[PDB]
Amino acid sequence: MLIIETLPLLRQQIRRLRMEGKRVALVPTMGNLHDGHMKLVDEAKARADVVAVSIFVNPMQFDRPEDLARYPRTLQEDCEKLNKRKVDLVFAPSVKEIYPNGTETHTYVDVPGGHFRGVSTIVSKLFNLVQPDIACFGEKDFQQLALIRKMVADMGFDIEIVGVP
Amino acid sequence: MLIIETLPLLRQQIRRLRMEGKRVALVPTMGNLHDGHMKLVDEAKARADVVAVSIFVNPMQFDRPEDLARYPRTLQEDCEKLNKRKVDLVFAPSVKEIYPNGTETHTYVDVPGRPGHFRGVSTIVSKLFNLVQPDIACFGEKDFQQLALIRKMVADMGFDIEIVGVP
Ligand SMILES: CC(C)(CO)[C@@H](O)C(=O)[O-]
Ligand SMILES: CC(C)(CO)[C@@H](O)C(=O)[O-]
Ligand SMILES: CC(C)(CO)[C@@H](O)C(=O)[O-]
Numbered sequence: 041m042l043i044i045e046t047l048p049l050l051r052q053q054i055r056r057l058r059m060e061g062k063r064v065a066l067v068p069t070m071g072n073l074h075d076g077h078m079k080l081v082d083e084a085k086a087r088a089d090v091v092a093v094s095i096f097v098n099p100m101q102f103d104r105p106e107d108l109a110r111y112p113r114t115l116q117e118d119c120e121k122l123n124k125r126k127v128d129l130v131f132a133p134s135v136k137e138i139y140p141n142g143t144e145t146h147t148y149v150d151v152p153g154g155h156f157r158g159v160s161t162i163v164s165k166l167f168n169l170v171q172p173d174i175a176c177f178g179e180k181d182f183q184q185l186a187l188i189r190k191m192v193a194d195m196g197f198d199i200e201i202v203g204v205p
Numbered sequence: 206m207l208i209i210e211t212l213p214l215l216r217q218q219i220r221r222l223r224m225e226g227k228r229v230a231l232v233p234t235m236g237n238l239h240d241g242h243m244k245l246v247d248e249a250k251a252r253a254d255v256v257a258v259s260i261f262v263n264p265m266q267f268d269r270p271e272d273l274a275r276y277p278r279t280l281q282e283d284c285e286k287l288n289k290r291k292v293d294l295v296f297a298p299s300v301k302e303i304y305p306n307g308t309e310t311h312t313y314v315d316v317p318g319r320p321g322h323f324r325g326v327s328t329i330v331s332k333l334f335n336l337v338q339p340d341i342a343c344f345g346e347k348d349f350q351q352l353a354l355i356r357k358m359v360a361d362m363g364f365d366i367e368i369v370g371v372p
Contacts, residue, residue, distance in 0.1 A: 051365060059226070140360075147327070147361035152310040160312070163301030164331075168363040171338075194312035196335035198216060 041123040043130045047169065050131055054171055062089040065202075068163060068173035071095040071132075072112040073121050080176040081125045083204045089172050090128040094166050099135060100143045101158025131170065138165065151191050159184055161189050167197050174200040206288045209296050211261055212336070218294060219338060227254040231339035233330055236260040236297075237277040238286050245343040246290045248371045252341055257294040258287055259333055264300055265308045267327025296337070303332070316358045326351055327358050341367040 044050045057064055069077055073095075086089045092176035094117055102108040121128055139146050151161040165176065177185050185203050192201055209215045222229055230253035232245045238260075251257040260283055261323040268272040280297065287295055304311055334342065344352050352370045359368055 047363070054365075058223075061224075118237070141318060147314060147316045147358050149312060149314050149331075149362075151312045165361075165363045168365070171365070191312050194306075194332075195314075196332045198220070198335070198338070 041119070041130065043119060043132060045132050045134065045137075047085045047133070047137055049101050050133075050169055054127060054169075057090055057203070058171070059191050063174070064088055064090045064092060064170070064172045065174040065176060066166065067091065067093045068166055069093060069095055069118075070097045070111065070116045072114055073118040076123070076178075078125055079204050080178065081127060082166075083202060084174065084176045085126060085158070086201065087176075087200075091126075092129040092131055093122055093127050094131045094132055094133075094170070095112055096131075096138060096162065096166075098158055098162040099139070100148070100161055101155050103154055114122070120159065129181065131166075146156065149191065151187050156183070156187055162186060163186075163188055164191065164195065167199060170197070172199055174202055176202045176204055179203045179205050206292050207294050208284065209294055209319070210298055211302060212298070215296055215336060217337070222255055223338065227339055228341075229253055229255045229337070229339045231254065231255060231337045231342045232258045233333050233342065233344070234258060234260055234283075235262045235276065236283045238283045240275065241345060241347070243286060243290065244272075245345060245371050246287065246292060248369060249343045250290065250292075250320070251339070252343075252369065253339075255293045256336055257296060257339065258292050259296040259337070261303060261329070261333075262300075263325055263329040264304070265313070265328055266322050268319035268321055289334050296333075309313070314358065314362075316354050316361070318357065323350070323354055327354060330355055331358065331362070332367060339366060341369055343369045345370055346370045346372050361369075 065088035067080040096109050149164045150157050151160050230249035232249050262276050275363045300370045315324050
């Protein structure tokens with residue numbers, strides 16, 4: 041398994057996978073992975089040659105800084121679990137790599153029809169960075185899954201959005 | 206030169222270009238092309254294997270229906286100029302095709318750091334960038350606020366697209 045923390049190195053591998061003809065699935069996560077997140081990984085492995093999992097606790101989608109600060113961070117353990125599940129690549133960026141000037145002045149994506157603006161923004165950016173053929177999301181957060189399906193339909197992303205029960 | 210009017214046929218074209226691994230340049234336009242747009246096309250041709258030009262009068266970036274309705278439409282003459290320049294693809298969608306559920310509740314992109322005009326720009330250019338997935342995209346320097354907007358949008362949103370400003 042490859043663990044990538046920077047944009048240039050991620051871009052290099054995305055390009056390599058593209059030149060190798062790999063079908064790529066992305067599983068976005070905020071880390072603190074449990075057996076339940078493996079449903080996403082297992083669906084992704086069946087549906088692609090290569091599985092990339094992002095781990096990024098996204099400040100733009102937390103209403104309270106207290107909650108962002110207390111969100112569990114267990115990177116070594118997440119990566120252990122992913123490596124055992126045969127994941128190919130983990131993308132684990134820093135906050136500043138994602139939001140160089142902070143979130144308040146960052147370009148955002150809003151899906152009509154703070155929390156959800158944070159979700160469409162980071163998921164669009166992960167789609168632009170990883171350029172996956174397929175991306176897997178839980179059905180449990182049904183508002184989030186609805187928001188991403190609409191975002192994709194509206195914004196022209198060529199990505200199959202897979203809801204996992 | 207091929208004229209592509211629908212998303213699924215554009216999808217077909219872009220998927221094919223991707224698996225062929227060609228380097229692709231996109232020139233976004235609203236048609237009514239003249240010398241300045243030809244400079245954009247020339248640059249795109251010099252910088253990529255394949256050049257796509259979009260022609261789409263984007264309602265989201267016009268505040269007044271009167272201004273949208275007055276915008277000149279010269280598709281035949283636009284295609285004549287692009288064909289002469291050996292453009293590979295011209296993407297010329299209808300409004301219903303880009304906005305099948307209307308602009309009002311369409312996803313939008315807004316870049317901080319007429320009310321509505323720039324939001325309409327960032328939104329359509331993001332969508333064009335997702336649809337076409339170009340390696341490079343050319344814009345004029347004269348609309349300097351637009352060029353700055355797109356420059357920031359690309360840097361912020363993580364698009365792997367080289368932005369080229371042309372006089
Ligand atoms: C989709 C996601 C990883 C985006 O930050 C997050 O909202 C989540 O944990 O569902
Ligand atoms: C898979 C999951 C943990 C992702 O948030 C959630 O959808 C769930 O519990 O099914
Ligand atoms: C960039 C653009 C094609 C977006 O509709 C338009 O604003 C233009 O022609 O400058």
